[PDB]
């Protein structure tokens, strides 16, 4: 039973996580739960194995000085997985959290045409939003391989480190591993300026810089797509401004009052009767909305959304009133009833 | 079939790009649609060697080691074209996107006398705005050409990379492009202070440091013209000084009062024809500015007609949908 | 009789500290109280040796160039001590400050089910504050038992150094040394965001960088738990933004408001819990920069299971005064 | 007469300083003045040589390099010394502070139950304060004394250098040289906290960093003790908030507020006898504190008088004269 | 036809500029008129060999790997100008502006005794200001030689490069030209304090700390002149403190309160002068930071020799009013 | 006639500096005018030779790579001088500025019991203030000499470079002269403190340390003196507080109220019929002015100056009504009349 081997078990057992940890057996995540695989405890030697096989002697060397490192690993014909290795009290430990391989399409995730109008937009900022485990990429994949499916456009996208890969159909895409195949988010995105492109992921909007890039990169007339971990239309709006100091909120609120075409704040419910399923808030950029951002009363969005309804959009609550539980669906909802 | 083939090829299409991407045949975009020329995929090595052939040992440096970069192109006779080199997931790749080269006139633009005051003026700074495609550096061009047919002055650009290319009339017209004749805006920005400027083209007022020695340059008594994405006049003037932490704010606010002669923004529609948003810089604008009650400027436009102010709007009132479309109020 | 010796007998009297001090024969504090052991007086020759056999020769020359260093140090089968060693007017010394091995249970300390609650939050900050030895770490023990008691999660914790150690039940718990299983803080929390983790303890707010680490973490999704020796939830807020540089405070308020889910300030024996909980208007009140309202939103809170430090002491009354905010 | 000698004939002269000057013969000071020992002038090289025969390895390196140093030095059965060496324009010169050796009861020096009670807090911070020569580590060592004698604790202290040697009874009393026994405030400060004490000695409130930490130790739960120059205990309050700058004064103050215990501010006058200022940190002056009301405070000292507070002129009114030189209000 | 003849034609036509620039003949500004001398186009080698002979090897290289640079260069027995080499589309480029050598005196510029008045001061700072071109080296220039034709004073200058030369009649003139008999602005300054001055010249407010310097001068006790691109009294005074970060601005606008003496902001052929003279209230206004208020206080200040720059230009109308602060 | 030559001249004719330039004869500032002695033209050659023959090695190396320099010298027998030396137009430049040899009495400079008073206080801080050349120095000089002549006290004096040097006559005197005795104003006060001093002169408080550690001195007990380049008592008051930043004025404001004990601000007048003459504004720190600084109200503390003629005290303006020209006077007054 080697690496190769517990790696095919975990995505036989659809698995989005495999962990090693000196003194455990293999442990996976699925559907948010890690358990331990019916095998024998791991002890250090063994762990310890397992990983510096994998590793590259840079690696190694990484690992061996920094006491931890991370890198991508292949399974050819299985998958390929982002590791995480370190050291803790019993020994070596490591994470290998598999990157997803088929993209899935929309219909097979059941998502209808309103995501479709999101992903027409002919420029802008549209935001896809949610906690760790959330599905958030896997709803950006989707809406790419829409546009792929539809338009005859540029897809540039700007990945650390990529995680779906796309095929070309109608658009051209090209995709960029920060560290490998560029220095950084910022230095791709000025570069993505002058690449001719109609489509930009920037995966996440933390560091300030790539968030007035991205901004940029809106206002100027692309397509942006970027995420960010907020649960809410609202709070992913008070999240872009908030983190920014006081000199630069107010450019950074009106180019975003201009630029933004929807957000979409998503989680997964676990489904009555097993697995889970998507609940989405969604908003769209509309003028009186952009007032309200402009304006900073964001405050009033919430029921802006609820009587959005004729353009699709629809509230975190709302959507959780059409699979699973009342429980499930009340442990998530903003006004439990 | 080599590079300059391809790009001949793109040009015979009528193409804006031309995209390498390793792994996928030449590919062009027309029209706005990015399509693939019948020719077999190219692969990593393929796509390298042309764009390694084409650059030269400082570009392959660049390239190499950052992984990406860029700069300018030109297949004699046909078009110069501004390059981004770079690698993705399949390899290398590389965009080509092709250089208007002539310069049109004001007439050939429809552009009215208001042009010709705002170009007129001895000094301070003129901003020209709009997103990409609303045809900013073509207004640019033909205000300088205006320039080049009337003054006996010294036209100074400075530019990443050398986009319209002029020729000195009754003006010197020294054009500098970036990366390669300076080692950047800031540089030759403080060299332009000591190069005996009449008039200085500054392509797109980005940086902090372009913006204050952009500034600089105007308020020393220089006639500045730099760009900017934003919508308005308005949301110009708010942007200038949005961008500067707060400490910096109210000396940028007071240097744009004093200096600022005009903002343009534009945009293109179909009929594509031009429209602009055209604000003046009068003594009760500027304390607008001043005091910082820009709020007020759109309607001190609405009534800067005599002097050839107009909004965006009223512009539009000269499809109607089209118009619409683009209408900061749609009525 | 050497050190293992001595520390084995402090432990056998049930000493929380055993000091050595050139001059002086070995104490140790129990119940509060620091005394001598009926030994001779160790000499500054004695006492350095004790220090320096126990040594390993990195501590051996941090000693001996910085005059003074930390360590762990263990006794197999009896316990392991947070060593500082030093110097003073009659020569060296060194304090060996045992550390609590076994876990307790939220019942055998007598939590009620208000930790649960707390603890079972899907995502955010908790923060758990007190003075020096007011039972911090023990309380979230507590709590870290109860989650791998309860959930199929992953706890992580990174530590200086690890004080509990936890073995899995249901939760996959990776516990990392700071030093010795990893360089930093700063660097564990980084990696934390990669290594799959429900739940991740930060045993030291330590500096500004663990903190915006730790706050990224929450905000992120995970459930992360700090400390901090603030004596009140209202201090501890204060304290959180307080700390950081006029430019930054702003996002760091913000962040706060949105993550954090409660606060349970202690003090000790039995505890005594101040407890807030992250509510709509309390958020409020942190990002508005009202938290001085909050002490009362504390008193009113009692449905959600809040209390403040004075209403628990109400359930010696001298005692009880001496740790009141109000004495009465 | 080596520096032994020197010394020892200081002392017998009762002396409290020996200077030493490079072209001067030995001076000591005595009831105020300094006076010339019969003695012939000391050159630089001796002067030099005697200053080098005490000092150790890294002390001369300091001086040597430094041009100026400072150590602690003892004459077995005489007495400790404070030690600077310097050089002037006639060469080398040092300076020889006798240290007070005896620990001096709260009894022998006439203070009162208040002290106790000061003492006895379990945790915070406590002040004592005054110019130089106003006995502020006096009253302190007093205080170390009492729990020293009364309390099972552990008492760690940081000095520089080492003034009162202290005798462990009850307490463990471990105490600190800096730059011997560590290498600064801020080093053994964040020792402290891990090195289980009770109670905390700094001589000498001065350096932000010293403040903070000592402000940390006395909020995580020990007590406190430091002293400062100033002469009262509202001006005391207003000096530990105003060194800081701007943006972290709010949480010294607040940490302030919850952590002050007493302040006791001091001076000696003829008759010598010590006068205290006392104020004992009570909710109200906490808020006065918190909410930056100090100015209020020594009124509300006036009206403490049951916890025993009481102002500096107060205290004054158990020679009239040399009273009122003293006095806050002279009356 | 070398480039000293080149040099020598443009003397010869009165221009204040020549050009080169690959791919033209040599062209010359003239009454602000840029135009072609009647010579064949110059190209690229031609131009690069014009400025690589006059080049020293450092300028060269400074040239061939920056790309561009500065640098003086004199034809004996004609001129000495500041010479800018760069590169453009077409290939290299170059532009020497002459330097005026000769100074004018107070009589010959039309100045009235305000301007003695104003040099006659024994110490603090006088600020000569206006766009490029607008005449305030020559300004300076007639004060400083009225003070050389009438007081035993020192007059040190700092300039980048030196523009006048004076000549030492009652006043000794020690002039020190930056790159080249001094390191810098700054160095030049800290040693002034110390070169037992009288009266200061400082070419350029460069940076924040040749401003520092500068007023430290003043305050010290000298007479300094410095200048700036300032249109106006007010912005002059604003820029001085606008320029410093938050934390310094309130010393920098006490300082410059205290020590500021005039403001004389300048256009241009004849010269228009805006005088302010620092009085009590006026160094109120800038102390208590309403120098809004200025504007009127030079209007009224008319006995002491202030006049805004709308009143002297009051002294063709059209030409006037494309320079007035209110066209009217 | 070599530079000793030179020098001996320029002493014997009470010049305060000699200059060479070249292109130009040796200068001599006598009474703060410039003039030429009457000696040929220096050309470069000379300058640089009679500069570059006094240097040391370290100064010819400061001087030839720095292109400027200063240092001491001294000419036995005559004085001790402060060299700067410099480049120019012409060439080579030096100012040899004369280092005052023999102190004055209070009695040679007239100075009256009111200096007396002030120097006698057992501690806090005296300013003496004007602009360069006003003589502060020798009036401090003074004072010192006085305590010297009555005080069996330590003086330490911390100099750049020390100017007048004392003999111990009564005090010990211990002077140090920094880069040379010590390393800087900071460390050689941080010792003062341990130095057994009554007496502590710091040379010039403008650099924020200085000024922290000088009031330390002075609130700590010692009496110190030092200077400012001030002309009244109320500039000079300003000064101090002025020079800090926001958050560190008010403590440095009740710091200076507590030990304040007077400030001697002063300027030189050519004297009718020949030389120059001080005149002095004179403050004394009393309760009521103590308050004045205390509560920011030094505004009112002109006037407070002007009826405290029973201590001494007295406006600039007032002194000069008491040798010098009336015009001369109105020159140099606050209020001319
Ligand atoms: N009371 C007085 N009457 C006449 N001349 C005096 C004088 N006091 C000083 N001088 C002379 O004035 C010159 C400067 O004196 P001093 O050096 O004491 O002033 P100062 O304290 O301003 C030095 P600095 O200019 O460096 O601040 C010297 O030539 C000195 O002899
Ligand atoms: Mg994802
Ligand atoms: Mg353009
Ligand atoms: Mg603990
Ligand atoms: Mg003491
Ligand atoms: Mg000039
Ligand atoms: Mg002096």
């Not at 996976?28 to 590793?55: C, F, S, T, W």
């Not at 549209?126 to 994949?141: I, N």
């Not at 797509?225 to 908030?242: C, E, N, P, Q, Y």
Request: charge should be negative; glycine fraction near 8%.
């Amino acid at each position: 039973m080697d690496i190769t081997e517990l790696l095919a078990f975990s995505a036989k057992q659809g698995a989005s996580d495999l962990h090693l940890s000196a003194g455990l057996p293999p442990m996976i995540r699925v559907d948010g739960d890690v358990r331990r695989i019916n095998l024998p405890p791991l002890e250090h030697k063994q762990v310890h194995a397992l990983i510096y096989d994998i590793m590259n002697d840079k690696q190694r060397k990484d690992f061996e000085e920094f006491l931890e490192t991370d890198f991508s690993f292949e399974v050819p014909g299985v998958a390929r997985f982002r590791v995480n290795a370190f050291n803790q009290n019993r020994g070596a430990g490591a994470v290998f959290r598999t990157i997803p391989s088929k993209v899935l399409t929309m219909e097979e995730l059941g998502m209808g045409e309103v995501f479709k109008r999101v992903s027409d937009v002919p420029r802008g900022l549209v935001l896809v939003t949610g906690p760790t485990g959330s599905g958030k990429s896997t709803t950006l994949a989707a809406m790419l391989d829409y546009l792929n499916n539809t338009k005859y456009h540029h897809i540039l996208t700007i990945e650390d480190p990529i995680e779906f890969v796309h095929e070309s159909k109608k658009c051209l895409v090209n995709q960029r591993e920060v560290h490998r195949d560029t220095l950084g988010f910022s230095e791709a995105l000025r570069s993505a300026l002058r690449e001719d492109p109609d489509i930009i992921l920037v995966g996440e909007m933390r560091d300030l810089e790539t968030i007035r890039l991205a901004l940029t990169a809106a206002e100027t007339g692309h397509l942006v797509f970027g995420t960010l971990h907020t649960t809410s239309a609202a709070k992913t709006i008070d999240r872009v401004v908030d983190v920014f100091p006081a000199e630069e909120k107010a450019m950074v609120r009106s180019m975003l009052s201009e630029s933004l075409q929807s957000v979409i704040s998503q989680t997964l419910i676990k489904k009555i009767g097993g697995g889970r399923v998507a609940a989405h808030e969604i908003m769209i950029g509309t003028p009186a909305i952009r007032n309200l951002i402009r304006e900073d009363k964001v405050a009033q969005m919430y029921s802006a959304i609820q009587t959005g309804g004729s353009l699709g959009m629809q509230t975190l609550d709302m959507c959780l009133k059409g699979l699973i539980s009342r429980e499930n669906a009340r442990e998530k909802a903003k006004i439990p009833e």
